[PDB]
Write a protein that binds this DNA or RNA. Structure first.
Ligand SMILES: Nc1ccn([C@H]2C[C@H](O)[C@@H](COP(=O)(O)OP(=O)(O)OP(=O)(O)O)O2)c(=O)n1
Ligand SMILES: [Ca+2]
Ligand SMILES: [Ca+2]
Ligand SMILES: [Ca+2]
Ligand SMILES: [Ca+2]
Ligand SMILES: [Ca+2]
Ligand SMILES: [Ca+2]
Length: 901
DNA sequence: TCGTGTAAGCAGTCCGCG
DNA sequence: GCGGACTGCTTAC
């Protein structure tokens, strides 16, 4: 097999590399890598190296990496560009793996771990590590085993061995319900003392050294705690055994309001799963506790125990250990679903970066572009300092707030990357500038043609057309990968709807789910077999189809994120190819494209309808248009349709056969006008929306920019078994909105769109009447909490104190003195509840850590003093009044003349 | 919230608005 | 009360 790296580090003048050799064995080597860098040279000097602008360069080979680094400094001192890859380990990887890396995940040691630390005096700070580590569960992907290290003797209590037999039993048998499928995979090791536990853990770590290290909050808690605890007990040298090269450093992570420390373990790639989740999941969660996320992702119940976690070991060590094991497994289960580790390996090896660098689109693209240019013996420019400057982005049309009955939407495929490719936008393809007219003049095609030679953006920039720039070439490669995976995702989605339809008529039989590839549209044969399957088999197939869809979603949306990240990186001062001319060339072209096609679509539909100046495009944002289809439906007449699916079919055909060709004609003209390299503005139908045929539903409504709701029957070729609400921006979509209020607002919207005014009024009256019964957590608001200290004046709110911060200050006074009480953590999320006038907390609201029950110290009083009236008005009535006033309907029945009977 | 970008919505504070 | 200037937070793209 072809070799591939696992990890790479620079340590002084050495590259330390862990890799899989040609025989599939893990090896480590130290290489005295001599880096090369470049300087511009005279044109008369014969060379094969050229910078991206075609200027000749001389290669400078250094005796060692420190010499190269010193030379860069002196070049700055002199005032001359020092060209080439200054991150020498990226250059090392490029030299050592000069081919497309094919990796074998089965050879990569992925470790998932979690620790427990009993602490009587509050949160055990990892930088202090003053409390014993009393449990470690460490899962190893190569062994496929859970290694459990259990401390039986501690200053906080001596306990008996954990019982695998009790662990396996149902919670209803007094067990812990450790999943049967991992029972045989547990290797349990009890310890008489913590020193023995940690010494054995390090020996184990040396034998089975993680390449990828993950878990939940491992970078911020588990790793620093273990490192510092071992340091405290044994000294620095022993703690450094966590690194295969015995090198670690404290890294200070800075943000806007403070800093925290992590431990860099040289020769390990730490991919904390909470951070993978935040980057790759495209969710914004009210809480990021593992309990909360596992419930959300896997629909598993809360890991239930009595009393505080600080007393759990002494009271129920059995459960303590089982829950530690289950915590490790839950991360594996989330990864089995989301496949973020797989994604990270894919992206990291593709770019030829340290795997942990996948968190950085700038580092990722720097490597991709460097490797690409190096293939042509081209030399990358030096990174420069730039002041942060604001620049313009997308256009968003102001919609007229209203109900909109029939709506068809259209959207440009991968807009910003498509613009980059169409226009040929790259650092080295800049050809010059032209004199810009106001954007309106290009939109309406009255401005002079920018260039008869070069490819243009309406920001004034011109680009070469003779050859593709490196940015277009590389972005195209990732776009093509993205497209493949999006294909699999949509197939799995369509396949899911086939199964949902079949579930209306399940067969009374005993059978098995079909062995199929859900990434491909079901054949006629498969569809026929599905129609004969039992509910049990169908439901298993639906689960599998949905899991396939999720895997496709992970693969495609994050490749989309990477390519859109390149467009954004052009506007980040730390990117090697930072250039606001290029960043604005993209965004300004986007503004033109949207408004150009709005005009073309309006012109086309006015022609087909025989009207003048009527606005068919009701809304657009960045690269999408929403088209009112009322007049198209009305031209055949609602009475002529057999059912909802009939008019959906009709609009689908109208969009594909009439509107899309008109749109493509419109964009081809725009391409010619801007003299672009290649026509890549591909705008296809997205949504078909409307009320159910014969209903009083309103179909859709807009309240403002980025705030709308649609009842969708077909989305990108997926014909739903049941209509799906597409709600954007409204409170149903916001993590700050209480959970039960999201639910209620969604049902209000469903009724508005599908059933009409009377249905909405019936539901509102009931919710208003019953909502006080809802669990307090379900009706609490949520907010991130920054700058708590700034607004804290002797425990009380200072000037301009935000509402949620005031709630935290109230909480802090109420728990003052109690060392065990859960503390609000700066930068994390809180639940927030309003308090009634005259409450014992002395203020109008209280806040506590999100994803948790409020401490029993104050729970009863919070419940007693909760202001239900304010809660309802603020979170429910106010947003609903917004929806209904926009939609021109009433959530309460108005008086009429009939009331007199 | 260490980690690519801008546009733009709503909650809430402070305080004007005769 | 509502609305502007401002901060804070959270979406859509
Ligand atoms: N997180 C995001 C989302 C969007 N955009 C920009 C780049 C996109 O190209 C454009 C339009 O956003 P879309 O959500 O419609 O995404 P794309 O057009 O890129 O992809 P798709 O093919 O799925 O429509 O907005 C961005 O910079 N960052
Ligand atoms: Ca725990
Ligand atoms: Ca798009
Ligand atoms: Ca599309
Ligand atoms: Ca059937
Ligand atoms: Ca879009
Ligand atoms: Ca206001």
């Amino acid at each position: 097999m072809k070799e591939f790296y696992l990890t790479v580090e620079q340590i002084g003048d050495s590259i330390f590399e862990r890799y899989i050799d040609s025989n599939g064995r893990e090896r480590t080597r130290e290489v005295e890598y001599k880096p090369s860098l470049f300087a511009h040279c005279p044109e008369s000097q014969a060379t094969k190296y050229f910078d991206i602008y075609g200027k000749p360069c001389t290669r400078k080979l250094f005796a060692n990496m420190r010499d190269a680094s010193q030379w860069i400094k002196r070049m700055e001192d002199i005032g001359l560009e020092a060209l080439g890859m200054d991150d020498f380990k990226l250059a090392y990887l490029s030299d050592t793996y000069n081919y497309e890396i094919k990796y074998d995940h089965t050879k990569i040691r992925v470790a998932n771990f979690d620790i427990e630390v009993t602490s009587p005096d509050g949160f055990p700070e990892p930088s202090q590590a003053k409390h014993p580590i009393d449990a470690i569960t460490h899962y190893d992907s190569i062994d496929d085993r859970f290694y459990v290290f259990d401390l039986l003797n501690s200053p906080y209590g001596n306990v008996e061995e954990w019982s695998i037999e009790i662990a396996a039993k149902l919670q209803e048998q007094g067990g812990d319900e450790v999943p049967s499928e991992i029972i045989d995979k547990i290797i349990y090791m009890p310890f008489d003392n913590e020193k023995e536990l940690l010494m054995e853990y390090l020996n184990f770590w040396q034998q089975k050294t993680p390449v990828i290290l993950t878990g939940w909050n491992v970078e911020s808690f588990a790793i620093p705690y273990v490192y510092n605890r071992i340091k405290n007990i044994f000294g620095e040298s022993t703690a450094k055994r966590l690194s295969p090269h015995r090198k670690t450093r404290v890294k200070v992570i800075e943000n806007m309001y403070g800093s925290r420390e992590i431990i860099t373990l040289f020769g390990i790639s730490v991919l904390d799963y909470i951070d993978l989740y935040k980057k790759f999941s495209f969710t914004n969660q009210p809480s990021y506790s593992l309990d909360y996320i596992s419930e959300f992702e896997l629909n598993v119940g809360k890991l239930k125990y009595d009393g505080p976690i600080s007393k759990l070991r002494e009271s129920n060590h059995q459960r303590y250990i089982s829950y530690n094991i289950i915590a490790v497994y839950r991360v594996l289960q989330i990864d089995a679903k989301r496949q973020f580790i797989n994604l990270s390996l894919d992206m990291g090896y593709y770019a030829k970066i340290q795997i942990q660098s996948v968190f950085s689109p700038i580092k990722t693209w720097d490597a991709i572009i460097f490797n690409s240019l190096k293939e042509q013996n081209k030399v990358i420019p030096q990174g420069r300092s730039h002041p942060v400057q604001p620049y313009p982005g997308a256009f968003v049309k102001e919609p007229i707030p209203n109900r909109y009955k029939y709506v068809m939407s259209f959207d440009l495929t991968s807009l910003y990357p498509s613009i980059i490719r169409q226009v040929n936008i790259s650092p080295e393809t800049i050809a010059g500038t032209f004199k810009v007219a106001p954007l309106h003049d290009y939109i309406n095609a009255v401005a002079e043609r920018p260039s008869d030679v070069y490819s243009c953006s309406p920001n004034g920039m011109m680009y070469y057309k003779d050859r593709d720039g490196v940015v277009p070439t590389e972005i195209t490669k990732v776009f093509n990968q993205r497209k493949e995976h999006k294909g699999y995702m949509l197939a799995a989605q369509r396949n899911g709807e086939i199964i949902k339809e079949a579930l209306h008529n399940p067969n009374l039989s005993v059978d098995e789910p079909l062995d199929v590839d859900y990434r491909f549209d079901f054949s006629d044969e498969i569809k026929e077999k599905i129609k004969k399957l039992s509910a049990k088999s169908l439901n298993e197939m639906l689960f599998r189809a949905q899991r396939t869809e999720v895997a496709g979603m992970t693969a495609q949306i994050n490749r989309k994120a990477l390519i859109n990240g390149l467009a954004g990186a052009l506007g980040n001062v730390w990117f090697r190819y930072y250039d606001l001319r290029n960043a604005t060339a993209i965004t300004t072209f986007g503004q033109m494209a949207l408004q150009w096609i709005e005009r073309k679509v309006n012109e086309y539909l006015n022609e087909v309808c025989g009207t003048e100046g009527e606005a068919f495009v009701l809304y657009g944002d960045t690269d999408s248009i929403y088209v009112s289809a009322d007049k198209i439906i009305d031209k055949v007449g609602e009475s002529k349709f057999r059912d909802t699916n009939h008019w959906v079919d009709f609009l689908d055909k109208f969009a594909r056969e009439r509107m899309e060709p008109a749109i493509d004609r419109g964009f081809r003209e725009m391409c010619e006008y801007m003299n672009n390299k290649q026509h890549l503005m591909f705008m296809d139908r997205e949504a078909i929306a409307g009320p159910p045929l014969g209903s009083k539903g309103i179909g859709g409504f807009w309240t403002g920019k980025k705030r709308y709701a649609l009842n969708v029957w077909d989305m990108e070729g997926t014909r739903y078994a049941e209509p799906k609400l597409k709600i954007m921006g409204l409170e149903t979509q916001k993590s700050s909105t209480p959970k039960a209020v999201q639910k209620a607002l969604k049902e209000c919207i469903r009724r508005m769109l599908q059933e009409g005014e009377e249905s909405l009024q019936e539901y509102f009256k009931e919710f208003e009447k019953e909502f006080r019964q809802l669990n307090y957590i379900s009706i609490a608001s949520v907010s991130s909490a920054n700058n708590i200290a700034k607004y804290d004046v002797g425990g009380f709110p200072g000037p301009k104190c935000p509402f949620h911060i005031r709630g935290i200050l109230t909480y802090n006074r109420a728990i003052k003195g109690n060392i065990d009480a859960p503390q609000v953590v700066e930068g994390e999320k809180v639940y927030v509840l309003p308090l009634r006038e005259g409450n014992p907390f002395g203020d109008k609201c209280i806040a506590w850590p999100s994803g948790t029950e409020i401490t029993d110290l104050i729970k009863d009083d919070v419940l007693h003093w909760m202001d239900y009236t304010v809660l309802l008005e603020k979170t429910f009535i106010k947003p609903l009044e917004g929806f209904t006033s926009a939609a021109k309907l009433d959530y309460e029945k108005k008086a009429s003349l009939f009331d007199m009977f």
